Amino acid sequence: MVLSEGEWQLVLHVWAKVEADVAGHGQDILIRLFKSHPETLEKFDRFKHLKTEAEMKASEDLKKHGVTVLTALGAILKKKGHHEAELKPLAQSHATKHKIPIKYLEFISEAIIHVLHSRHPGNFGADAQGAMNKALELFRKDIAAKYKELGYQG
Numbered sequence: 678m679v680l681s682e683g684e685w686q687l688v689l690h691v692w693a694k695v696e697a698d699v700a701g702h703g704q705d706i707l708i709r710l711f712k713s714h715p716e717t718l719e720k721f722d723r724f725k726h727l728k729t730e731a732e733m734k735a736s737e738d739l740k741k742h743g744v745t746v747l748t749a750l751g752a753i754l755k756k757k758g759h760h761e762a763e764l765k766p767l768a769q770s771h772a773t774k775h776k777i778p779i780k781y782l783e784f785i786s787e788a789i790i791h792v793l794h795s796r797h798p799g800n801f802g803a804d805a806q807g808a809m810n811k812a813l814e815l816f817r818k819d820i821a822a823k824y825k826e827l828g829y830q831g
């Protein structure tokens with residue numbers, strides 16, 4: 678699948694507002710994921726002891742990881758589909774070390790769309806959401822293909 682230039686522009690336009698507060702978006706997305714799908718929290722030995730949203734919001738450690746997550750995803754998006762090099766080490770560690778099924782990549786994709794919809798309604802209308810969903814579907818499809826090459830079904 679291939680996105681048009683118009684679709685990439687919708688994606689990068691809303692991402693530019695995300696980059697105004699990377700740590701805050703990183704927090705909201707991870708907390709959203711953990712509250713909506715609590716089984717994902719079990720993949721993080723670092724975090725699985727956090728019992729409540731209040732404890733999550735206070736964790737400087739979780740906030741740091743949100744920044745790492747959003748910075749990696751941002752670098753991928755800015756490649757506008759030319760992301761094979763960024764994707765190799767990410768697929769390797771999430772297949773082999775962390776063992777993250779594609780289903781969980783779908784769950785965090787929903788958290789991203791939900792947070793952007795909440796914080797940026799003016800820049801995340803139907804067309805912009807469609808473009809963002811397409812970009813994330815492309816990310817997941819390419820990561821799934823690498824998973825298969827590396828020997829993990831996901």
Ligand code: HEM
Binds near residue numbers: 718771
């Ligand atoms: C857009 C989706 C995601 C991106 C861009 C991303 C990115 C990253 C990056 C850059 C790291 C640090 C380096 C590395 O180990 O590769 C990391 C670590 C990690 N990721 Fe992800 N990740 C994503 C989704 C997920 C999901 C959905 C889960 C689990 C449900 C997960 C589980 C983990 C774990 C357990 C670690 C190790 C954390 C630690 O102990 O420090 N990742 N991720």
